[PDB]
Amino acid sequence: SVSKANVPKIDVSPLFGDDQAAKMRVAQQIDAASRDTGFFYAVNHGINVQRLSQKTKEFHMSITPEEKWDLAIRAYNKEHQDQVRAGYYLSIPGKKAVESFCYLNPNFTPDHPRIQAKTPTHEVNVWPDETKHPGFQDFAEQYYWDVFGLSSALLKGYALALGKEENFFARHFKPDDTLASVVLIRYPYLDPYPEAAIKTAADGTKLSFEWHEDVSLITVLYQSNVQNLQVETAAGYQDIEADDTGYLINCGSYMAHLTNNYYKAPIQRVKWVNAERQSLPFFVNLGYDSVIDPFDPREPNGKSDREPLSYGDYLQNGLVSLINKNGQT
Numbered sequence: 001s002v003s004k005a006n007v008p009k010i011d012v013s014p015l016f017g018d019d020q021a022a023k024m025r026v027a028q029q030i031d032a033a034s035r036d037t038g039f040f041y042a043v044n045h046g047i048n049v050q051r052l053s054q055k056t057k058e059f060h061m062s063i064t065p066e067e068k069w070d071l072a073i074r075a076y077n078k079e080h081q082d083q084v085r086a087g088y089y090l091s092i093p094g095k096k097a098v099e100s101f102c103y104l105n106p107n108f109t110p111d112h113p114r115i116q117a118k119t120p121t122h123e124v125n126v127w128p129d130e131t132k133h134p135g136f137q138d139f140a141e142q143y144y145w146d147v148f149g150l151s152s153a154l155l156k157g158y159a160l161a162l163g164k165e166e167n168f169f170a171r172h173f174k175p176d177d178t179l180a181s182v183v184l185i186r187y188p189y190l191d192p193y194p195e196a197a198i199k200t201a202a203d204g205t206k207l208s209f210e211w212h213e214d215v216s217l218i219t220v221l222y223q224s225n226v227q228n229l230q231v232e233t234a235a236g237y238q239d240i241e242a243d244d245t246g247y248l249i250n251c252g253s254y255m256a257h258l259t260n261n262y263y264k265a266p267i268q269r270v271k272w273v274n275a276e277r278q279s280l281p282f283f284v285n286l287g288y289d290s291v292i293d294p295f296d297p298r299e300p301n302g303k304s305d306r307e308p309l310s311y312g313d314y315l316q317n318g319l320v321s322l323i324n325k326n327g328q329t
């Protein structure tokens with residue numbers, strides 16, 4: 001009744017190199033995947049995802065209720081009015097199974113001019129006690145830059161795939177201003193599993209999270225070896241096989257906008273599965289004032305009707321809309 005999506009594995013290592021022709025061959029694979037289901041698996045990425053999964057688990061399984069309140073975002077703790085994005089997202093036993101921890105650009109400090117200006121979507125990360133979680137902040141901050149370097153390379157491939165120079169996107173992806181975020185999501189094993197946390201799709205599938213499109217330029221996602229994700233096609237939702245050695249990549253809704261929907265943002269959802277697992281997305285966001293001129297690779301002139309959209313405004317509205325539609329995570 002449910003088929004499987006074709007998610008090809010793409011060796012992205014040439015995108016770190018200087019072999020321009022081998023990088024074009026990668027870009028071709030990115031193009032075909034973005035025109036098909038919208039997903040591919042980046043392999044030969046150079047990131048130690050075993051350590052990522054290990055450190056994330058140690059954190060998830062040792063953080064206490066007291067620590068979670070102390071780090072909670074505004075939605076769970078009224079004392080933290082400045083934490084709209086960064087902080088801990090608490091579970092609700094009996095009602096909400098998922099919980100997570102989100103942090104932003106480590107360069108967002110009290111000295112950063114965007115923090116000084118109080119610009120929306122900019123926040124200073126919060127962190128647990130170093131002695132209670134030794135090495136976690138240092139591991140997490142390094143991972144932000146590890147996956148940032150991978151994402152920069154991926155963006156080179158997407159740029160070439162669309163007929164642009166390889167810095168078309170990456171020039172807007174900078175350490176000093178990127179709004180990109182990491183989210184460490186824990187999906188717990190629960191017995192009994194609360195029914196209030198399980199949603200029933202229109203087609204009858206039991207879901208942990210309803211359909212949505214990523215709010216991002218691209219999404220660089222690691223998940224443990226538990227199949228859960230599905231992508232919508234015209235013939236219905238298709239299962240995305242799990243691969244806990246690589247990264248699941250897809251374009252976000254900002255990419256759809258700037259390419260006149262040539263690279264669509266795939267509609268994705270999360271099947272319910274009673275299994276302890278991890279979902280660790282990196283949302284490749286640009287700067288608050290970054291603006292990419294839309295174009296249409298279908299057209300000889302590449303002309304597009306779409307208005308240039310400032311990334312900051314896109315992000316703010318996108319994250320609020322996602323909360324209004326799919327609920328507070």
Ligand SMILES: CC(C)[C@@H](NC(=O)[C@H](CS)NC(=O)CCC[C@H](N)C(=O)O)C(=O)O
Nearest residue numbers: 085102181185209212269270279281283329
């Ligand atoms: C792979 C996804 C379905 C993953 N969930 C997600 O990506 C979820 C829901 S779509 N993403 C979000 O809510 C947006 C988080 C944005 C973040 N707080 C920020 O300020 O930057 C999962 O595993 O649940």
